[PDB]
């Protein structure tokens, strides 16, 4: 519903404004597992769009090492659906103990993560993975807006409100390809998963958090750029390669993988967010939306089609 | 020889001093494939030891995206044994075109990379992988020294001169374990490779640049921290897990992997640099030396033992 979306945008924008108005040194996006994916996209956007110190850190590494750039003026941003994820609670409570301000995105304001946080941005029980991107996008892009580094913010932020409608349509359009991927590869002993830059988080997430953890499928996730520095030698006729393309400046690197793999393997799959219309969203924002498009396609639809063919409930853990 | 080593140290220190004396904004370590490994260790040291802006970037991603933190005051550091590696030459020539100063480490001063560079730090034809670490260490730690962030520099930098002698001894001590690893796993269809923080570059390098590229062995390299966020579900009795331990603050994260894997797989291998004496090097520097120790053990010795058992020359490429 439109009203939920406008409310979500307002809360994220209020956090961004209070952060900007208070002042800050560095922004550290700290998390673990699948929750890193949208943070890794933010980091890739930040490389091009801001001179602000922006970092993404594995929360368990960060609590063991500390960081000389993390100081009492920093803000640490965390995300946990449950708000109980041990490493995220731990880094939030560690920041709090040091007087380092924390943002928490979770679906429960009395979760331990939310109680450790300076700012809580709620997610609603029914919210799928696109909301993790949308809330982090409103937060991060509003900071850039206030810092005079995102002069398209108003239009971007309004158009982000209609991404959910576009994602429903994309998922329906993807469904036949998703069934075909799952049909052919559910019984694969080894899949190569390739993508990079702002798309790397989605390849990372889908490979480890869905296919390995929830379907016990062996994968080799590798970036498009680094594919050509050794992993390419493993490709042959019968090896599956699933390529996730970006719509930013690194699309050319993805296309090099496509051209090489198309000559070598009979088992090339291309997941291209550029194939999906985003009605009412300007083309200049497609490179930002793309990781969110792919995440919803892979986490919602492709996971469900693998589950259908394996017969292995996505809820199963052997550990 | 001692005289080669002292000369190498002097040249790296002179570059560091000229960089520091000229002034700089950010330091970007930009490379591809195996040449990233020592840069990724530097980045992990930098997280704890300096407030200077230090970045490691995949050179092909960096040339496509640019970076808003990369400006005419930055220094870009590159490494290429040949000095011909396309992506490294490309990023150096792109910096030069923009008036961005470049450091090049290569074994040939008339290589294209060396001709694009503001500073050339030579490697000698006979120099193994430890020299990539030692030259980058003298360069980076001398900058930290000049910036009043490394007050042990003198002792560190002198003790680094005796690492080569210690590495020869380590390789001889490792040789029996190396033969046993290669004997058991040369015919493996799938190996998990685990490590992290300052050790991640060595796990990354060995898995993709040696086992995949040069022996066509399928690997899953994954960090110790992130192992527990999905990849762990793939481990079972018959699955090989090679764990590379650190000697820094993330050793505890490596030990969690060890304790879990030891209960589940019959095929746990531990490569622990803490097992090797560094005579005449103070314990406080072991966490810095460790990635260099592991790199020389894996690149020199373990590669050669796999080659012996596979019969597959490390020089072979099918692409």
TrEMBL record, chains A, B:
It holds the Pfam family SIS. It comes from the Bacteria. InterPro entries: FrlB_SIS, Fructosamine_deglycase_FrlB, SIS_dom, SIS_dom_sf. One of its GO terms (molecular function) is carbohydrate derivative binding. GO terms for biological process: fructose 6-phosphate metabolic process; protein N-linked glycosylation; UDP-N-acetylglucosamine metabolic process. Residues 15-149 form the SIS domain. This is SIS domain-containing protein. It comes from Salmonella typhimurium.
